[PDB]
Amino acid sequence: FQQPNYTANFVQSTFNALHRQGAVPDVLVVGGDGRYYTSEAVQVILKVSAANGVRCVWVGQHGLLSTPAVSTMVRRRRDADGRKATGAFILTASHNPGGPDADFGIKYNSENGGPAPEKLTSQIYEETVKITHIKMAPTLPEVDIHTLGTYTFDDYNFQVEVVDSLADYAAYMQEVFDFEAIRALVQRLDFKVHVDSLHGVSGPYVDRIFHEGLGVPKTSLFRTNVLPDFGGCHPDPNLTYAADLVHVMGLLPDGNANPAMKHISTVPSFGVAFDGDADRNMILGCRFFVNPSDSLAVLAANADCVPFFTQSSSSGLKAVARSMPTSGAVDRVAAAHDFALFEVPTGWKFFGNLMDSKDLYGGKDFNPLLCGEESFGTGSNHIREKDGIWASLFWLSVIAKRNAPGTPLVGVQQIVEEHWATYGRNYYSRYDYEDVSAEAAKAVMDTVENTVVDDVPNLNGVACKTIDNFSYTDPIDGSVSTKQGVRVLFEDGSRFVLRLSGTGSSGATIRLYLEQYMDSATVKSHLAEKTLPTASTALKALIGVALQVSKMESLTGRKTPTVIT
């Protein structure tokens, strides 16, 4: 794959946002997705950056730095003459299952530690394409990024400090979580764990935290060495092919399923995998899959477990936000408690603003905020990036806050089921229809809008109302966002949503989301007394509706979807 002249134009571009003259006080952090590139392309970043006029650069050891640690280092990290970096370049694409022929993508995070605002990122579009001349000027330095220490240079008081890529991130997690209580959980006699980093930059962190930090044996953590995959494995958490973690616990790549693994004494009670760049995660139990949304909710209900939210004489937890496409199981947790909810659009910006209210830009002073998306990861205000490894420690703290010394402990399945038993369960599943004609794709979008708009009380089920094409107005900056999903809400809380995902000319993919509430067949009785219906069968109703409504089968020629969550 190729693109405009080199890639440095991007680095030059972000500097064409920062207007001159900084002089020599600008410090930035470098590091990115494990592999494959970085090393040979890190050099490029430094030469250009130094040719632009930054004083100092903190590169991560080996050029590796997980996104959440990136934000961490730019946020809370002051030492060596005492300096704070005002920006950072992250070398990750995240949504790239491979990288043959040196495929590449790059990210930028701003002074608040989080990703660059929409204003900045869109202005870089111009420079990346319109660049008529670049400035690098080989003189020619080529630092060693694999050895700790600082390298001071001439012609411009420049300096590259290769920093340990793990100490600060592991230190932060030790502060926000009661690691001592987590130790009691994993250093017990009836709790087997299983972490997989898919040879992702999260790898080293897993070792440094789960082994050196908690004390879990190394034989539980898997694929914790960074590598440039050529014949596996995909760094995208899902049910399919990446059914490795899925299989270990004893599942099929068809949701909660079951074959010949029912009674095996070798099934871990907790398995988790991490995204390529540790920004997103997937958490599993002994034969139990936790929907990313159900996960968000459980963490919200039992947030009194981590000191981060408890200490600082806080209110306990006053905040909670989620992408609209995400299931509303976290809404019901915001009901049984008093913390104010947000249903924002897709994109992190909104999370940034909601977080950025305590220490910047008015609004609600307190900000102990939690965040999450359907396409997993989730996070909080502790950093300004979604964090995978953080969540896994969260889920440990929750299970820890159960006290099982001696007596047997409740498994994750119960905990979620208990949580299902307390607030009721929000079924969630997503139907993808890939490679359809944009004609038919939009036709389905208009049909579900238009035909439902002027007939709100049409169709089946209960009173299906509040149907709209989701628009949202940012409460902190005042941005207005539209056409971010044709909603079709029901009375009880159920809904089915269509969202159109299609970048450029290559067809499109109808993103049909399914959500059906139920508080029946429970609660408090351990496992509805063997009447486990299960989320997949009861969604058949909502499916029958949706297709009939959207005329989806009639407009596209698709009986069955491409993907199912």
Ligand SMILES: [Mg+2]
């Ligand atoms: Mg990612």
